[PDB]
Amino acid sequence: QSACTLQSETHPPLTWQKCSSGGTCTQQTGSVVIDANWRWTHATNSSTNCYDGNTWSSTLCPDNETCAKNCCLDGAAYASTYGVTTSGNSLSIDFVTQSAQKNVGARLYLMASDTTYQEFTLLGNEFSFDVDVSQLPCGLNGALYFVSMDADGGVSKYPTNTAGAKYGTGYCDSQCPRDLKFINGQANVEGWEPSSNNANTGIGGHGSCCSEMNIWEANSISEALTPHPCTTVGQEICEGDGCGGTYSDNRYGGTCDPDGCDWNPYRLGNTSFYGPGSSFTLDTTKKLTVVTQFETSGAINRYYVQNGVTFQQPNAELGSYSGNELNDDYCTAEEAEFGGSSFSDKGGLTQFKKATSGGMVLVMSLWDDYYANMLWLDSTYPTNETSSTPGAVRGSCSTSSGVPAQVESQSPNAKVTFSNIKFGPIGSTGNPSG
Ligand SMILES: *[C@@H]1O[C@H](CO)[C@@H](O)[C@H](O)[C@H]1NC(C)=O
Ligand SMILES: [Ca+2]
Ligand SMILES: [Ca+2]
């Protein structure tokens, strides 16, 4: 796709801190850009929509190439249309925003400049951020994660894409999303199937895969940390059911691991650690700090800070594993106790180290789940399972919670606030901000 200028594109500013081993942190100035899928896609020479509702224009978009040549992406009014606002080192995302149309959530990327994404090399470093999930009920997911996207949004690899990072192009993740309207400089009109439960989305014949580090997926009820390796580290297009993931038929037939080696304190047995109220170690009605460390061995560590008190990731006992570190032993025991082989089949933490050794883009979003109602995060899943089944219970939400249409109309004011992002070598982010 190309870019049009009927509506100006002004990326809301966002500062963050970069720390060093010497004990100092310095303020960095960046900005955020919304994903291309949320943008107005129309004819380059007119205001005629190339995509409307959940269907493409059969005249403007008869095939993937013609569509990309005839269509462009336009600017976004962050606050008024998407409910996205920033203030200093803070970023807030509103769940539902009503303007000329109804918007639900957003997916944003941190930029290094007006035309490029900020890349982070996680291995040997730690990432810290503050979050307020008090306004996120069952069925919602305020996420902060990393994906192996290109810094230019794919422009150098695919000439027909001239919008680039400035317009939020180039997305990819471990589920090889087929709901993307534009992939590899082309439209995803071929093989398009409108959603039977979502009037604004569909599934195309191609997907976009890449490694994904889900540092934070959570609401006021549950939270999970999950690395997802792929046989191909960076962005790569996939075709049809060969994509695997949520959008396809065979979930494990692709090059990426859609499940991951997840760590959910509640799912592992500690049901009093994270929840809303003073009866929980971490009170989700109040802001908290989340620190994630990527050691060179490939293992991941995590600690939290609330009201000045530090809490390491709670201890878990699973099979022959015991500890609070996400490592090979944990992931192996999880597959043995909870079932599955996807993570290990994709190389495990060793293959994942290849992703963290390279650059990854920071993503921040808020979404509801049209495929599984977020039950996999905060409820019993599958819903037919019981509590006696190892790993079935992941949260206290009812198995009837998370219906998109219901949460969107009942909790439109829901929102998430991410702030005070700090990045640097392990042991450095707790030092004085500059
Ligand atoms: C849950 O984790 C917290 C913090 O590590 C700990 O104090 C508490 O004893 C744990 N509770 C259970 C039931 O494991
Ligand atoms: Ca994902
Ligand atoms: Ca270690």
Structural class based on helices, strands and sheet pairing: mainly beta
CATH topology: 1,4-Beta-D-Glucan Cellobiohydrolase I, Chain A
Number of strands: 33
Q: What are the bound molecules?
A: 2-acetamido-2-deoxy-beta-D-glucopyranose, calcium ion
Could you state the CATH homologous superfamily?
A: Glycoside hydrolase, family 7, domain
C-alpha-based Rg, rounded: 21 Å
Main β-sheet, in a few words? 16 strands, mixed
Number of helices: 7
CATH class: Mainly Beta
User: What gross morphology would you assign?
Assistant: globular
The helix fraction, in percent, is 10-25%
Distance between the termini: 40 Å
* Beta-strand share of residues: 25-35%
Number of domains: 1
CATH architecture: Distorted Sandwich
Protein name: Exoglucanase 1
EC number: 3.2.1.91
GO molecular function: cellulose 1,4-beta-cellobiosidase activity; cellulose binding
Subcellular location: Secreted
